Amino acid sequence: SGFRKMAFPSGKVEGCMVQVTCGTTTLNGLWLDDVVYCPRHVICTSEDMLNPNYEDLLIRKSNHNFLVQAGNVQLRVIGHSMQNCVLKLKVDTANPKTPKYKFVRIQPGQTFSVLACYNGSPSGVYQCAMRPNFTIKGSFLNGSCGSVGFNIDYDCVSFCYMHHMELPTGVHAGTDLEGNFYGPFVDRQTAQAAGTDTTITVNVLAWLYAAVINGDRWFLNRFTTTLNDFNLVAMKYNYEPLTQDHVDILGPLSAQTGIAVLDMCASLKELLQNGMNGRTILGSALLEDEFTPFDVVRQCSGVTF
């Protein structure tokens, strides 16, 4: 029993973290096979942050201008290239600790673990969701750039996020491992606004099922609703519209608990319209939306890796 924001075991990713230095700027890189991946803004100076021309700045850099350090050993950089917003540094040694891996571009509302690093060394690990507005609410200090987000399936690490920047609002923005930003953000020090941050409705429902599984059920009500009726409520409260795909994804939890998805929607509707009256659900006084239906099944079934 019990329900916690649980990250994946981070060891397979720890063995891939390296330090990348270019000039006076150091950040984190990801060493898989003989390629080190890192944010291209490693080539930026104080001058460059406001409006960098990355192609022009890159041209002034040769292989020997990138120092890559794994622990205390120095990798030899034998090639470099820019792919969208990431740099790919070819090194002369394949990482002996390279796990089975894939690069994946995740959908908004999906979750992943972040291994926060500084100077190529791991600091901690925590679970995140890609917000509907393509930000993440992480914990990142100066130098955390190039830390990665990932999921693990048995023995395979799916890398889905590289950290690039903090917005002036204090939320975080970054790329997939092909260097394409999630959302409309760009890697320059300019004012950038995130859009409206809506709540991931299918995730809240999954967490309500997790609560029922754990015995927390004061919120189960006497009503049902319809998809269209519920979504009238979701829109007023900045919740993502619920679709039949979402209902289908909740199927396994619905079957485990015997609670029809639309019945749980009606409970959520009453929760949105009346609040929680000073009660808690799974130790929280807010409706939590950073657990997917898969996350719930994993933690309530004990899937290992």
Ligand X SMILES: C[C@@H](O)CC(=O)N(c1ccc(C(C)(C)C)cc1)[C@@H](C(=O)NC1CCCCC1)c1cccnc1
Give the interface with ligand X as residue ranges (CB under 6 A): 1, 27, 41, 44, 49, 140-145, 165-166, 168, 187-189
Least separation in angstroms between residue 207's CB and a second copy is 13
Q: Which is nearer to a second copy, 40 or 163 (CB)?
A: 163
92: left (phi over 0), alpha (psi -120 to 50) or beta: alpha
**Among ligand X, a second copy, none, residue 14 binds (CB under 5-8 Å by kind):** a second copy
Q: Residue 115 forms beta bridges with which residues?
A: 125, 148
Least separation in angstroms between residue 54's CB and ligand X is 10
Q: Residue 23 forms beta bridges with which residues?
A: none
Least separation in angstroms between residue 6's CB and a second copy is 4
Q: Which is nearer to ligand X, 27 or 261 (CB)?
A: 27
CB atoms inside a 10 Å sphere around CB 8 = 19
Among the listed residues 38, 145, 160, 265, the single catalytic one is 145
**Among ligand X, a second copy, none, residue 168 binds (CB under 5-8 Å by kind):** ligand X
- Reading the block at residue 215, the tokens are 């015995």
Burial of 116 from C-beta contacts in 10 A (0-12 / 13-18 / 19+): buried
Q: Which is nearer to a second copy, 5 or 105 (CB)?
A: 5
Q: Which is nearer to ligand X, 137 or 279 (CB)?
A: 137
**Among ligand X, a second copy, none, residue 10 binds (CB under 5-8 Å by kind):** a second copy
**Among ligand X, a second copy, none, residue 123 binds (CB under 5-8 Å by kind):** a second copy
Cα separation, 237 vs 235, in Å, equals: 5
Give residues in contact with a second copy (CB under 8 A): 1-12, 14-15, 115-119, 121-126, 137-144, 166, 170-172, 214-215, 275, 278, 280, 283-286, 298-305
DSSP class of 290: -
Please indicate whether residue 246 is annotated as part of the active site: no
Least separation in angstroms between residue 27's CB and ligand X is 4
CB atoms inside a 10 Å sphere around CB 52 = 20
Please indicate whether residue 265 is annotated as part of the active site: no
Specify whether the CB–CB gap between 255 and 170 falls below 8 A: no
Residue linked to tokens 């693990």? 152
Q: Which residue of the chain is nearest ligand X when measured via CB?
A: 145
Residue 87: its H or E element? strand 86-91
- Reading the block at residue 180, the tokens are 């394409």
Q: Which is nearer to a second copy, 98 or 224 (CB)?
A: 98
**Among ligand X, a second copy, none, residue 303 binds (CB under 5-8 Å by kind):** a second copy
Closest CA to 179 of 56, 68, 278, 38: 38
Residue linked to tokens 């999954």? 206
Q: Which residues contact 282 (CB under 8 A, 6 or more apart)?
A: 3, 207, 210, 211, 214, 216, 288
Least separation in angstroms between residue 87's CB and a second copy is 22
Least separation in angstroms between residue 192's CB and a second copy is 15
Among the listed residues 41, 80, 163, 172, the single catalytic one is 41
Cα separation, 224 vs 57, in Å, equals: 60
**Among a second copy, ligand X, none, residue 108 binds (CB under 5-8 Å by kind):** none
Q: Which is nearer to a second copy, 5 or 76 (CB)?
A: 5
What are the catalytic residues? 41, 145
